[PDB]
Amino acid sequence: GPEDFQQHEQIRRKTLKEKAIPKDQRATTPYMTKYERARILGTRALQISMNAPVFVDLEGETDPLRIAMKELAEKKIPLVIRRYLPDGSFEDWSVEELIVD
């Protein structure tokens, strides 16, 4: 009964761990792509709009997208990009580990 679920969970975790590419050998672009920058800005703006904690000084600002742009400028966005290779294997680059433009 439950052991069927335990087997399925074990298999899912094993396939996930096999798909992940370890940090020491990721061969993708060091630069943040324009698509990644846009989606980081949009998602961080959504999170701020939904009352998430903010890591920058609000200069009396009200635009969530502007606040997210400020966070990206000061590299304070707690997000991670999971770049997907065609075979389903993926790498993980943190936002502060990437260079904009």
Binding site: G1, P2, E3, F5, Q6, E9
Partner: peptide, 19 residues
């Protein structure tokens, strides 16, 4: 009854162990 107050799916890890 939303994805904000109740879990999406619940599964049992093991058989219930009496304490």
């Amino acid at each position: 009854a939303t994805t904000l107050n109740t879990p999406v799916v619940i599964h049992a890890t093991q058989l219930p162990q009496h304490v």
